[PDB]
Design a protein around this ligand. Sequence first.
Ligand SMILES: *[C@@H]1O[C@H](CO)[C@@H](O[C@@H]2O[C@H](CO)[C@@H](O)[C@H](O)[C@H]2NC(C)=O)[C@H](O)[C@H]1NC(C)=O
Ligand SMILES: *[C@@H]1O[C@H](CO)[C@@H](O)[C@H](O)[C@H]1NC(C)=O
Ligand SMILES: *[C@@H]1O[C@H](CO)[C@@H](O)[C@H](O)[C@H]1NC(C)=O
Ligand SMILES: *[C@@H]1O[C@H](CO)[C@@H](O)[C@H](O)[C@H]1NC(C)=O
Ligand SMILES: *[C@@H]1O[C@H](CO)[C@@H](O)[C@H](O)[C@H]1NC(C)=O
Ligand SMILES: *[C@@H]1O[C@H](CO)[C@@H](O)[C@H](O)[C@H]1NC(C)=O
Ligand SMILES: *[C@@H]1O[C@H](CO)[C@@H](O)[C@H](O)[C@H]1NC(C)=O
Ligand SMILES: *[C@@H]1O[C@H](CO)[C@@H](O)[C@H](O)[C@H]1NC(C)=O
Ligand SMILES: *[C@@H]1O[C@H](CO)[C@@H](O)[C@H](O)[C@H]1NC(C)=O
Ligand SMILES: *[C@@H]1O[C@H](CO)[C@@H](O)[C@H](O)[C@H]1NC(C)=O
Ligand SMILES: *[C@@H]1O[C@H](CO)[C@@H](O)[C@H](O)[C@H]1NC(C)=O
Ligand SMILES: *[C@@H]1O[C@H](CO)[C@@H](O)[C@H](O)[C@H]1NC(C)=O
Ligand SMILES: *[C@@H]1O[C@H](CO)[C@H](O)[C@H](O)[C@H]1NC(C)=O
Ligand SMILES: *[C@@H]1O[C@H](CO)[C@H](O)[C@H](O)[C@H]1NC(C)=O
Ligand SMILES: [Ca+2]
Ligand SMILES: [Ca+2]
Ligand SMILES: [Ca+2]
Ligand SMILES: [Ca+2]
Ligand SMILES: [Ca+2]
Ligand SMILES: [Ca+2]
Lengths: 194, 130, 971, 129
Amino acid sequence: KTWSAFQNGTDKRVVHDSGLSLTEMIAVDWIGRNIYWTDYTLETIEVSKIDGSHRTVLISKNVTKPRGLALDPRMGDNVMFWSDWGHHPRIERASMDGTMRTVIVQEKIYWPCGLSIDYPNRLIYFMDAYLDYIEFCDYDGQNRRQVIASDLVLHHPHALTLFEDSVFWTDRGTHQVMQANKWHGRNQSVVMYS
Amino acid sequence: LYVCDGDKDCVDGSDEAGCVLNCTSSQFKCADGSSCINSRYRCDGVYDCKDNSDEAGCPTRPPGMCHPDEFQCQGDGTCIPNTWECDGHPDCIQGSDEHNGCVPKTCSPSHFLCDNGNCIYNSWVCDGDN
Amino acid sequence: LISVRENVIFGISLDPEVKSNDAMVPISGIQHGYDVEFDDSEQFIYWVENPGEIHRVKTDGSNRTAFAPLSLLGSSLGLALDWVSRNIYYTTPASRSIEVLTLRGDTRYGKTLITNDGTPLGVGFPVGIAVDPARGKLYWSDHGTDSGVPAKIASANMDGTSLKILFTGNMEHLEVVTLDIQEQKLYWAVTSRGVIERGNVDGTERMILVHHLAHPWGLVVHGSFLYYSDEQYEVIERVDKSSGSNKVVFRDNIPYLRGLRVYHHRNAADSSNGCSNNPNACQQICLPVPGGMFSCACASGFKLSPDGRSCSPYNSFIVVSMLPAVRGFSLELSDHSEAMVPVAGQGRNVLHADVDVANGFIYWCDFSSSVRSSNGIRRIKPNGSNFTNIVTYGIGANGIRGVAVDWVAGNLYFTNAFVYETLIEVIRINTTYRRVLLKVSVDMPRHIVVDPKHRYLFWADYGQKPKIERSFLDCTNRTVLVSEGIVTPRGLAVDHDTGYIYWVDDSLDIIARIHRDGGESQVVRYGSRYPTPYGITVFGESIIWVDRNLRKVFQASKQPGNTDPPTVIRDSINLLRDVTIFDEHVQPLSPAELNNNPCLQSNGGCSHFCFALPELPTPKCGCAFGTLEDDGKNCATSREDFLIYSLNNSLRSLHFDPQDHNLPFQAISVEGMAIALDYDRRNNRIFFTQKLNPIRGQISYVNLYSGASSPTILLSNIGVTDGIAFDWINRRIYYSDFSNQTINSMAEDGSNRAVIARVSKPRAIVLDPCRGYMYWTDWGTNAKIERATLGGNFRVPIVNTSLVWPNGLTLDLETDLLYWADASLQKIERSTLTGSNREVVISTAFHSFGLTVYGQYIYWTDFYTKKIYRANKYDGSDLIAMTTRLPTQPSGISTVVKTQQQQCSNPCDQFNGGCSHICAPGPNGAECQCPHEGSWYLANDNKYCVVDTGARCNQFQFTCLNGRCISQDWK
Amino acid sequence: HRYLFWADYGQKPKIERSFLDCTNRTVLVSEGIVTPRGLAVDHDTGYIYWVDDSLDIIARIHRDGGESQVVRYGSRYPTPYGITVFGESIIWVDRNLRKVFQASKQPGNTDPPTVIRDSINLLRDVTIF
Ligand SMILES: *[C@@H]1O[C@H](CO)[C@@H](O[C@@H]2O[C@H](CO)[C@@H](O)[C@H](O)[C@H]2NC(C)=O)[C@H](O)[C@H]1NC(C)=O
Ligand SMILES: *[C@@H]1O[C@H](CO)[C@@H](O)[C@H](O)[C@H]1NC(C)=O
Ligand SMILES: *[C@@H]1O[C@H](CO)[C@@H](O)[C@H](O)[C@H]1NC(C)=O
Ligand SMILES: *[C@@H]1O[C@H](CO)[C@@H](O)[C@H](O)[C@H]1NC(C)=O
Ligand SMILES: *[C@@H]1O[C@H](CO)[C@@H](O)[C@H](O)[C@H]1NC(C)=O
Ligand SMILES: *[C@@H]1O[C@H](CO)[C@@H](O)[C@H](O)[C@H]1NC(C)=O
Ligand SMILES: *[C@@H]1O[C@H](CO)[C@@H](O)[C@H](O)[C@H]1NC(C)=O
Ligand SMILES: *[C@@H]1O[C@H](CO)[C@@H](O)[C@H](O)[C@H]1NC(C)=O
Ligand SMILES: *[C@@H]1O[C@H](CO)[C@@H](O)[C@H](O)[C@H]1NC(C)=O
Ligand SMILES: *[C@@H]1O[C@H](CO)[C@@H](O)[C@H](O)[C@H]1NC(C)=O
Ligand SMILES: *[C@@H]1O[C@H](CO)[C@@H](O)[C@H](O)[C@H]1NC(C)=O
Ligand SMILES: *[C@@H]1O[C@H](CO)[C@@H](O)[C@H](O)[C@H]1NC(C)=O
Ligand SMILES: *[C@@H]1O[C@H](CO)[C@H](O)[C@H](O)[C@H]1NC(C)=O
Ligand SMILES: *[C@@H]1O[C@H](CO)[C@H](O)[C@H](O)[C@H]1NC(C)=O
Ligand SMILES: [Ca+2]
Ligand SMILES: [Ca+2]
Ligand SMILES: [Ca+2]
Ligand SMILES: [Ca+2]
Ligand SMILES: [Ca+2]
Ligand SMILES: [Ca+2]
């Protein structure tokens, strides 16, 4: 199941039933009052009303194995991004209503495990657990750079988040949460231990 | 809540250092004597105790979980391409990919071999990405 | 098209090139997916899980529910639906049965159509089911059993009255059967050979249609095409119904594949049958039969009448309990029909069942070590119309081990088992009134039974030296009926006619009876012929009992010495645990039958509880909370006593009655933050602890009775003090300091100060002056609770294990119990003054600053929720919040009780009143005595005694046991 | 009757019957035995009687097994430690009552017992000469 609560633990409620897969992502719209989530067993991307009252399946034709989902709901952008782990692992972008679809990164993805957006710069940040890297590109994939890449720092990443000039990620191989500088990684810190 | 849970939540573990080690009810026990931990964790896939012995007792998973093009990870219950199994890098969370004796895999001329014993396509050798 | 996978259900469009997978809103969260069925007239889809439960959801996602959770035993394996009669059919192997349920309206009706009957035609292990409504025919597939039932495809009538076998042989590991209504043909698949076969509904022909598969789940036929799925090939594909020679594939590389269905607007007018033609023609269930005719049937717990239109409920039946379910059997052993709607489903572990025949209820208790929700007491009606939870909060670690019901008083009695303690509690059946009547300590009462005619309550004990005990309905009296000859009393029963008690033992392998007044024990059906009698009941001139090893229910005559071979009621029942009877005769209600029980009429006028006491013509009343009043019937909550707490500056008062929103005293405001409070009965005054800034601690006192006098100050600047305690016998104040890691003592006016002990982070102090002890909490390294004398001269840790962050401590002098709170483990624990017994009172949603105990309740204040909470001090069986969300984070709490013992009633308790030997009860104050044998003599004062010759030494010394004197400085 | 009988005190206690050369083993009682402190045989009828201080029971069985029968059960017999059979009577000793008792061996009889000696300490077994 999927649950919604307040930042103080009160008013626990159920949005909708959810898939049993350990690889799942949820996205929310602070404008459209809609919620989007990924399904790894049915191989689908689904949209609903933030209160869960209405449900629909939005993309099903090529999303072999979703491992990441990110949204930009601003009036002038209205874009949705997700990552797939099929035999042709790629990062795909589509209008928030699925009426437009494009492939943004497909040349070196092998085990995508993170997807996050940086709204001021209009950048995408994604993580790969096979080549062990954190890399960012633009909404079209025509600008691309690598923040952190080494078998020493990244062992088994699973989630990525961004705040100011810092990037935060989680690693299952070291049971840790890490903070770094999102442009060059020349600053590294441990946010939570064990 | 955190000051006695078997998890060293800070650099020196000041929280856990003060706790007793007697294994109250439902607390599964570990040989290193580090901490006693709740039974529910026994087969969830996390090495909850220091000497890797909470899950060590657990049984194996249904083999039908992955396609023939894939290999399965016992601790995580996840599927990874067959080529990755014995490539020389631990891909599974608990290292289930490098198993027993691998008959070590080698690198062909269309690829390059580096310091860490990994094989990479020749075009990648010098393009700006490590 | 609809396809199932062990964790997902999804819909495919029926053309093979449309690869979209959202023809319907999917069904996520499935755990053990199995076959599915659909109803289009209400936009519903139903699915089964094995192991699991039967669930229905709507095609648009608007609703999701579990359809038959209380009657379903084990897991179902196949579903069939009838849209003409509006009936659903499902098959369950755990009960070797095929069952029918009615979808029409909000009121379910359910019966079992086919089960074991010794014949090979009967149902064995039914895995597959298909139905045809227009022709009134039902078809099922069954793996068979060791009863001679073959692996088969069988045909029956939807009313269950006819059985025939269509196909057999070459059938091992057969999973699904499906029917085609236009062809009148049946299709099934076999995994042992990898083939799909077709047959005729009359058994006239058998043929093979698909040749190479590996575990092919699912068959469905629509129009000219047949669809099947394969597990090992991970594929779902379609083939020509008429040829089997050409194939198309809809989806591939899909894992954990399961069976399939097709969704279309099938209509009842075309598929019409007798039930559709004659609506409302049956009172409960309507089942079609061949030739367009129909049949009527009653739900479980009901029987059918010669008119065929009506059903009548069973009013006299036997009730049997098994760990997985509760079932009823007719008194007529020729009737194998269910006498009550069974009780079965997830979490079932039934230990005991009891009945309230006059009100129409059955009450049972569930006990599981590994699952919290499974433990409890629940009541249901034999018709299944009502289900309720009676006791689900405040259950000990060892669960509830016994339930007894009293139909005269309208009371329920149960036993609750904690770690080192057991409790016997009574609850009024329809009101939030629950009380604890007895705390049993070393004895372990499990089985409990009550008799209102003789006004006695009986229970059995399972610990060391097991025994059977007799008590009164208020547990104010305890007596032992049997001590010798008991090892494992698995069951206890009482006879309401004769007033005799019977018990069964599987270690002794004996059934034995005793008389309510004790005395001579008597033996029934002893020997190896009774390997494991687990439950017994008494009815008329007979006793009925169940045996775990023989898997049987037996009836015999209760008089001892009889040896007629027993009588059998039901064979082959697994996990039998208890037997009970549901008949008006076992629960009389006439005053002449109940010996004029006072509670029989209007609860005897008692407000909370009514308890008939042997040989007392008037009722007796008990209060769940508060105290009892001189009218002998009502209860009050001592408005003379109140609770006092501080928010930051505002000292506020509260009443123990959560409905009495009046304030004991209006609110008072003080400088800074008031953190800790204590009150004294002598002055009607409060002593409080004040924090002025993060560095300055202060102590002040305020008066309630002295008009409206403002505060007075005792100490102006000390470290931040977080705890205060008062001693009214010695007129001393004790306080703790967090900034200085110290516990200090002072006098009522501050003119005298002393320091008692040092402990890191000394949050709380507790005092007992008549016994001379003080207790304190240390949450630093090696977190402990510690006890010392009022002067700190002796010191010992009361609790130093399984404790991490003790931040609250309180003591109750009525029970001599100590309670503490831990913020790391988020729980409240109670123990004795020695720490020899330990129990947990609250373990859920727990944050707390203060702790205080009054009456049957324990109270604490919570800074996270900004609320004050009240619970029951023995088990936490009740939880309520005394206040709305307060304006700011609460502080510590104290109680104002006017009935305090302002003087010690037993002066010898202060370390023998200071003596070494026998202390006299206050003749001229505390006074001392030596053994009357031997020439002993009283010394130091009139105090030490080991002086056998009256030998002399100088008074400036101190004179010891063993006859030696030493300078006082060495004392 | 050319039979040899013995009682077993380990896990799953039982009573067994054998031939004088122990070449045959058979079990007469398995259920209803916890602490068989004493075993006696009747040479007239060929019946076997045993006493138990855990069960607090005196019970008899037939040399060919089958139906178990009960004598003087209840709290009135706290610790019967030894039993012997003589004529129409059984004689047994009780460790807690410090007494020697005589009663009739037929089951179901409940005549109050008869006493032979009082105040005997540490009683363990009775035999007849
Ligand atoms: C407790 O409440 C139940 C449910 O309201 C009462 O049940 C009714 O009992 C009367 C007889 O006293 C029946 O005629 C009604 O059919 C019952 N109603 C239902 C809904 O079942 C019950 O009487 C109350 N008291 C006790 C002691 O159970
Ligand atoms: C989706 O699948 C179709 C058909 O297999 C293919 O032509 C198309 O390139 C795919 N699109 C993506 C983004 O993979
Ligand atoms: C980043 O790291 C450098 C050293 O590499 C250090 O001097 C600097 O203070 C760091 N900055 C922050 C904001 O942590
Ligand atoms: C340690 O735990 C055991 C039970 O596992 C208990 O018997 C023992 O008393 C405990 N020791 C202490 C010091 O509490
Ligand atoms: C189904 O869900 C709706 C949501 O509003 C609710 O009104 C209704 O009571 C539920 N149950 C039924 C049977 O429709
Ligand atoms: C359950 O009981 C209540 C009253 O106690 C009654 O109103 C309700 O109808 C009952 N439930 C059903 C399904 O009849
Ligand atoms: C309670 O039991 C005692 C014996 O234990 C008995 O003397 C007394 O009469 C009983 N109480 C009443 C009210 O009869
Ligand atoms: C009590 O708390 C409120 C906020 O909760 C604060 O504004 C007020 O100043 C506090 N009292 C004192 C005396 O500071
Ligand atoms: C703490 O204790 C010391 C003596 O041990 C005393 O001098 C001091 O005044 C106390 N209070 C504070 C706030 O240090
Ligand atoms: C705990 O208390 C016991 C006595 O109750 C004592 O023997 C033991 O040493 C204590 N252990 C600790 C760590 O304080
Ligand atoms: C939690 O937040 C909700 C509003 O989001 C509020 O109603 C509630 O009082 C808050 N509770 C606490 C304990 O702060
Ligand atoms: C020995 O016992 C067996 C049964 O255990 C019996 O069949 C056999 O007859 C006995 N021996 C003799 C010589 O009778
Ligand atoms: C492990 O368990 C699975 C089922 O969960 C199979 O039984 C498999 O054969 C087992 N054995 C090994 C070593 O994988
Ligand atoms: C390495 O493996 C490849 C196949 O992937 C070839 O077998 C090659 O011959 C191997 N090289 C060595 C040195 O054994
Ligand atoms: Ca920790
Ligand atoms: Ca684990
Ligand atoms: Ca590898
Ligand atoms: Ca490169
Ligand atoms: Ca037995
Ligand atoms: Ca005894």
